[PDB]
Amino acid sequence: CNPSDMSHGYVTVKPRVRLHFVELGSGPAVCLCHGFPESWYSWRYQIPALAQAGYRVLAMDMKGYGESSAPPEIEEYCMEVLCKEMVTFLDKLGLSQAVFIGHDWGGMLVWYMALFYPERVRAVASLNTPFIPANPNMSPLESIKANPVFDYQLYFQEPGVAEAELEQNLSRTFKSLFRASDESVLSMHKVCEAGGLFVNSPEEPSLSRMVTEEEIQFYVQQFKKSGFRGPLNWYRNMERNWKWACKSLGRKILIPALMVTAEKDFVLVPQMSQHMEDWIPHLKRGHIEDCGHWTQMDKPTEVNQILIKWLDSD
């Protein structure tokens, strides 16, 4: 995928903040929302496929990333603020609605969009990220003690720490992260007592089967502008996000919905989604075998097929 061959759009959603996106195709608007720590470019395989399938694709740089604004303040990346900005995005583009498709943190965003702004969301799809109604009893910090696979999230809390490690060597960062599950050089059991995320992983990791050197270098260039502060801030609003989700928990998602699970995502595990039909009875599903966290990159053909089928039906 060549960026200069793409149409680049820019929408100021408030004085300090503009969102960049890439746009391809004609037809119903489909807004793609990437996760951490990614880019509009993580959708490179879906963009032309969806456009060819008859859709107008808007692939975002989410707030904090690429050519979009990345203010430093933690509170600029709470879900409530992020969602209101996506609604302003649609307004300024003159879109009454769009289909929203998200992955990872972008998947959490699209569920909140469907929940609090159903009038603006035609249909909702998430890759890897389940939708669980807020639990009125437990805080999100309490859920890390119950579920220890999210211990790296505690490491991500302290401003400056994860940033310094992830920005030290961008090429090594992206090569370490973007790998098939069987190629993985990272463990999520205890990270901050271990000293850091990369402490015991190769200084010059090999290039994963999933990615070329050229694709890795694109991410490198992108993260040179703002680095990891904005992206990491997405993790630093757990209590605010929890309190906002609580303001909804009575109401239901009534729009068409798709939950796509990845067999080998060891952080956002397929089973984390098991009882979603209890609160979304009309929920459709996709499941991808031999697929790690980096779904769109790991199994693009399978992602394309699942999304196009669902888009063309419900």
Ligand X SMILES: N#Cc1ccc(C(=O)N[C@H]2C[C@@H]2c2ccccc2)cc1
Binding-site annotation, residues for substrate: 152
Burial class (CB in 10 A: 0-12, 13-18, 19+), 251: exposed
Q: Which of ligand X, a second copy, none binds 94 (CB below 5-8 Å, type-dependent)?
A: a second copy
Of the candidate spans 26-34, 44-52, 73-81, 100-108, the one that interacts with ligand X by CB under 6 A turns out to be 100-108
Locate tokens 């009454």: which residue? 96
Kindly list the residues in this chain that would bind a second copy in the complex (CB under 8 A).
Answer: 4-12, 23-26, 28-29, 48, 51, 56-57, 92-96
Q: Which of a second copy, ligand X, none binds 125 (CB below 5-8 Å, type-dependent)?
A: none
Question: Measured from the CB of residue 174, what is the shortest distance to a second copy in angstroms?
Answer: 25
Q: Which of ligand X, a second copy, none binds 39 (CB below 5-8 Å, type-dependent)?
A: none
Candidate list 34, 63, 293, 299; residue touching ligand X; CB under 6 A? 293
Q: List residues with catalytic annotation.
A: 104, 235, 293
Residue nearest to ligand X (CB): 108
Residue ranges of the alpha helices (H) in 169-274? 170-177, 213-226, 229-233, 238-246
Q: Tally the C-alpha atoms within 13 A of residue 38's C-alpha that lie toward its C-beta.
A: 25
Strand 17-24 vs strand 7-14: parallel, antiparallel, or unpaired?
Answer: antiparallel
CA distance 80 to 61: 18
Candidate list 108, 113, 123, 280; residue touching ligand X; CB under 6 A? 108
CA distance 109 to 86: 9
Candidate list 53, 177, 280, 303; residue touching ligand X; CB under 6 A? 177
What is the SS3 assignment for 108? helix
Question: Measured from the CB of residue 120, what is the shortest distance to ligand X in angstroms?
Answer: 21
